[PDB]
Tab-separated table of C-alpha atoms and ligand atoms in Angstrom:
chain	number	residue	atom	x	y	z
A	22	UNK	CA	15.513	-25.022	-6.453
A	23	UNK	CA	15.698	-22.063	-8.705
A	24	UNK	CA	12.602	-22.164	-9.779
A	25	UNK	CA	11.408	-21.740	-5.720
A	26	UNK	CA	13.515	-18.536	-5.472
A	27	UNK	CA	12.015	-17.092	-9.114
A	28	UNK	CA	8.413	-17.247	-7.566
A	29	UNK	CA	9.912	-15.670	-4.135
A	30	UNK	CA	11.210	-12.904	-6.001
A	31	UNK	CA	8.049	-12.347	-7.344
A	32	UNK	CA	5.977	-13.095	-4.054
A	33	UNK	CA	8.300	-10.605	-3.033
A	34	UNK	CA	7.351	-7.613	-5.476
A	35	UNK	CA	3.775	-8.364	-4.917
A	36	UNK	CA	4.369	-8.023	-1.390
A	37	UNK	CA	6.141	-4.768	-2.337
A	38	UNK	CA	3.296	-3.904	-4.715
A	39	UNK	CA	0.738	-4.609	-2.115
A	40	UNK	CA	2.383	-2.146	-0.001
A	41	UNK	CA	2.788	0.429	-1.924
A	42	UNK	CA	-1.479	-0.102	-2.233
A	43	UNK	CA	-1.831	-0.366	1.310
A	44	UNK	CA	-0.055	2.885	2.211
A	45	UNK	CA	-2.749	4.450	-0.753
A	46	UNK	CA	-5.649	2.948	0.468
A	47	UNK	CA	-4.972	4.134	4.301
A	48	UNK	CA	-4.038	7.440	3.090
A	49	UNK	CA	-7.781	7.256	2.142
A	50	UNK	CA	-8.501	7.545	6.233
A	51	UNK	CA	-6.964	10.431	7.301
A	52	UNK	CA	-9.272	10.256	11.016
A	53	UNK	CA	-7.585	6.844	11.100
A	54	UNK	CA	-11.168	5.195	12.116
A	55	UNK	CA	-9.722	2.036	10.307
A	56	UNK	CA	-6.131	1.649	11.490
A	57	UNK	CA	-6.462	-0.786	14.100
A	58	UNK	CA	-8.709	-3.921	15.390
A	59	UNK	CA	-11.915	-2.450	16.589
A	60	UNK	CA	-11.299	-3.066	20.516
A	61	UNK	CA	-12.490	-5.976	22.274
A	62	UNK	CA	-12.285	-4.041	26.051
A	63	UNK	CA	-14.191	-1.182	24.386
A	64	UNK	CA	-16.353	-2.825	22.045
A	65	UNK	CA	-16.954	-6.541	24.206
A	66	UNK	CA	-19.942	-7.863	21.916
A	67	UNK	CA	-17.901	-6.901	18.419
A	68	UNK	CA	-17.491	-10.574	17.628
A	69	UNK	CA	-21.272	-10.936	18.740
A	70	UNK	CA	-21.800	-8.729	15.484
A	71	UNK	CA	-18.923	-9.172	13.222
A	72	UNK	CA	-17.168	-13.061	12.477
A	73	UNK	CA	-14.101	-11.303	10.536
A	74	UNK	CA	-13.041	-8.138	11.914
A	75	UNK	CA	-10.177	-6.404	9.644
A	76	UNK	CA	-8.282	-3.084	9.960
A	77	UNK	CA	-5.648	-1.586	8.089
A	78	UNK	CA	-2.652	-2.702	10.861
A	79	UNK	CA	-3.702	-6.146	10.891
A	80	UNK	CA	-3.784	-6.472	7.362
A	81	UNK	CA	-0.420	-5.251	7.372
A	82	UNK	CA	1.061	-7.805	9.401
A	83	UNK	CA	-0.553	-10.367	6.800
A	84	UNK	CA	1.240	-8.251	3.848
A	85	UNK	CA	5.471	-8.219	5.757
A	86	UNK	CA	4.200	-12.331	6.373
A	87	UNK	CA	4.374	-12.016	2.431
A	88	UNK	CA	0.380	-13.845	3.348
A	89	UNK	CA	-1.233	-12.438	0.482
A	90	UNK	CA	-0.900	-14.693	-2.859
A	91	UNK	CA	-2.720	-12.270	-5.023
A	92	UNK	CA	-4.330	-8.990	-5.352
A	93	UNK	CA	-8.262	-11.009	-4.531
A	94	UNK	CA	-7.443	-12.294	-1.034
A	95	UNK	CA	-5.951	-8.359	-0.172
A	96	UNK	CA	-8.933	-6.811	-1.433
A	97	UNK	CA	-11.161	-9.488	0.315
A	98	UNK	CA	-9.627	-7.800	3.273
A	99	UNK	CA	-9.753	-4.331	2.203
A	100	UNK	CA	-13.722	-4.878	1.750
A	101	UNK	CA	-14.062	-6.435	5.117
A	102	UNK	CA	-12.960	-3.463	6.453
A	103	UNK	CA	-15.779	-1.277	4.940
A	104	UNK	CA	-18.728	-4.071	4.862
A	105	UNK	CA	-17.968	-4.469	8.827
A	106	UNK	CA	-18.182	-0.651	9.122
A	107	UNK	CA	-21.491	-0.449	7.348
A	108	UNK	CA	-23.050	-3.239	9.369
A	109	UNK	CA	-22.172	-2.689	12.536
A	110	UNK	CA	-22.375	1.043	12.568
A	111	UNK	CA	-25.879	2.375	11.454
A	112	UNK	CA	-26.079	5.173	8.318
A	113	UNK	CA	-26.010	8.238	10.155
A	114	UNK	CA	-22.684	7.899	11.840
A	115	UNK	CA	-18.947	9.040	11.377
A	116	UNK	CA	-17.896	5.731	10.841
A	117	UNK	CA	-20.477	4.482	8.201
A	118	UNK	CA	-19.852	7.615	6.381
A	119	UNK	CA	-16.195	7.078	6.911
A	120	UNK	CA	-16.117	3.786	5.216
A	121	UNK	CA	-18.117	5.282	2.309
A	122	UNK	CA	-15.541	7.707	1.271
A	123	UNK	CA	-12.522	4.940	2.287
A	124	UNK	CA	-14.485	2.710	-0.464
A	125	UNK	CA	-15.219	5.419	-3.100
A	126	UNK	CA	-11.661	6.571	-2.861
A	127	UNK	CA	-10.288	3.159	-2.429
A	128	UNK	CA	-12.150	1.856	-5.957
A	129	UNK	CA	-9.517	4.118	-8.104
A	130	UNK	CA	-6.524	2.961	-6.395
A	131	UNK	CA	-8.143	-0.759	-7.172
A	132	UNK	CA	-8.376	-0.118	-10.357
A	133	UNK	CA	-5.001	0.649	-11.153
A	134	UNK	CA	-3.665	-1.986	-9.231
A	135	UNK	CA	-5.557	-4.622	-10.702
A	136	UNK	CA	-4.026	-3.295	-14.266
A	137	UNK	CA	-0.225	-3.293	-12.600
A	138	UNK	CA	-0.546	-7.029	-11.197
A	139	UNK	CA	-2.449	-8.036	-14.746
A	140	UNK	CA	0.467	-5.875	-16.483
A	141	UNK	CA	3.784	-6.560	-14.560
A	142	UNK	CA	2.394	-10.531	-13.651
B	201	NA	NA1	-26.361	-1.887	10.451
């Protein structure tokens, strides 16, 4: 149907929104503490700690799958980045801090794309 390819298209600019968000949002991390899985070798009781460990490479595999429906289920993602960083790391660390200033920063590029997806549909 035509009607299957008119929602691809679309699915396909929100996959090219949701990239353009992504590269934004991990611009945000310039130390790169959130770029890939936390390791399992150097971190062994991670999953002890966290159920849903997310990081910026693995949420861009998701995003070229075209896996993301909307804008919600990406920032789900985007937030388990920074509420895994604040529990499993304690307050006075570079990584707590680091997930501070990823969310702070993040928030205004949220903003804006929540407008674009509400504007452009
Ligand atoms: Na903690």
């Amino acid at each position: 149907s035509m009607e299957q390819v008119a929602m691809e298209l679309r699915l396909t600019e929100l996959t090219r929104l949701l990239r353009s968000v992504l590269d934004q949002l991990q611009d945000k991390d310039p130390a790169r503490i959130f770029a890939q899985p936390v390791s399992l070798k150097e971190v062994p009781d991670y999953l002890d700690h966290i159920k849903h460990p997310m990081d910026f490479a693995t949420m861009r595999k998701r995003l070229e799958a075209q896996g993301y429906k909307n804008l919600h289920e990406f920032e789900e993602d985007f937030d388990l980045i920074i509420d895994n960083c604040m529990k499993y790391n304690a307050r006075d660390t570079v990584f707590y801090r680091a997930a501070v200033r990823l969310r702070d920063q993040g928030g205004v590029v949220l903003r804006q794309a929540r407008r674009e997806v509400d504007s452009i549909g």
